[model samples]
Structure formats: C-alpha cells, structure tokens
Target chain A: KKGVVHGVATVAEKTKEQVTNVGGAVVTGVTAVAQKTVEGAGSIAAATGFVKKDQ
Target chain B: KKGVVHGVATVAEKTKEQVTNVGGAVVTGVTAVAQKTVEGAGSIAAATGFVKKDQ
Candidate 1:
C-alpha cells in the first residue's frame, strides 16, 4: 500500500501547477482591465475639451 | 493688474492638463510593467517542466 498513495501525490502536484496558472491569469486580467480604464480616462479628458470656469 | 493676471490663470490650467496626462501615463507604465512580469513568470513556469520533489 506504500505505492498506492502515489495517486494523491500526483494530484497535489497538479493542484500546485493549476494554482500557479490561475494566479498568473488573475493578475493578467486585473492589470488589463485597469490599464484599459486608465486609457479611457485619458481619452474622455481629451474629448471633453478642457474649459476653465470663473475665467 | 486684473488683465495681466490672466497669464497666471492660463498657466495654471495648462499645468492641470499636463498633470492629468502625466498621471495617466504613469499608471499605464506601471501596469504594463507588472502585466509583463506576470506573463514572464507564467512563461517560465511552463517552460521549466513541473518536477515534483521528495517523491
């Protein structure tokens, strides 16, 4: 039975690999979303035509 | 002196606009760098071939 538990050992290794992939994917997704938001803000500001008030 | 002060007013407005652009650029730069780092880590992991230890 010493070798029978090798199944769980393999599963644990696979789990770690999956976690690494998932972490990277999450980081990428968040960065991409925030990056686009920054771009949008810049675009909107340029389009709005800066107008000074009480001038 | 009132009309002469308009020079400073324009300068202030320009400064604000510049600040907005600079802020957006900084955010974009940081996010891009971090995003690339995440990508690199994932790439390296995939290339290295997952090896289990103490098995």
Candidate 2:
C-alpha cells in the first residue's frame, strides 16, 4: 500500500535521474565530436593538398 | 502484501521502459548530429577556400 507507493516513487525518481544523466552524456559526447569535426576540417583539407600551409 | 508487490513491479517495469525509450531517442539524435558534422566537414572546408572543388 503506502510502502509500495514509496518504494515505487523512489525507484521512479532514481530512474529519471539516470535517464537524464544518460541524455546529458550523449549530448556532451556529440557536442565534442561535432566540434572536433568542424575544427579539423581545415586540417583535413590541408592534408589532402587542397589547402596550402605556411601562408 | 502480494498486491502491493505486483503494483510496484508493474510501475517499475513501466518506468524502466520509459527510461529505455528516452535513452534510445538521445542516442539516435546524437548519432544523426555526429554524422552530419562528419559528412559536412568537407563542405565547410571547401567553402572556406581551404579546399577547392574545381579540381
């Protein structure tokens, strides 16, 4: 009865926290990779000889 | 008694499923953005004149 509701509430809250944490981590990782990709594009172009260095 | 256990179990399972759904959506979004970043990097480089497209 009441105990069950309490237990369920606790579990639900904990699960929500875990889900939020997972979502945050996913966003963080994606942000990092996206930043890397955008930042490294010039270097990649340079490496491919499309862009010249020592300018 | 047993009814409380059953109710709690049901709620716990539903919450678990919802969490899983949220996690899946986050992963899907991150994967899409990550892919776009990687694929679009070349265009960014070219647009900046670091890589030419006429070649």
TM-score of each: 0.17, 0.19
Which number leads on TM-score? 2
| Clash list (residue pairs), candidate 1 | none
Q: Which regions of candidate 1 fall more than 4 Å away from where they truly are? A: A1-15, A19-32, A36-55, B1-16, B20-55
* Residue-by-residue lDDT tens digits, candidate 1, A1-55: 2455632244343342332332222232322332333444335422222334455
> fnat, candidate 1?
0.21
lDDT score at residue B49, model 2, on the 0-100 scale: 15
Chain B TM, cand. 1: 0.14
lDDT of each: 0.34, 0.30
Off by over 4 Å in 2: A1-32, A37-55, B1-17, B20-30, B33-55
Error of 2 at B47 (Å): 29
Model 2 docking grade: incorrect
DockQ values, each candidate: 0.11, 0.11
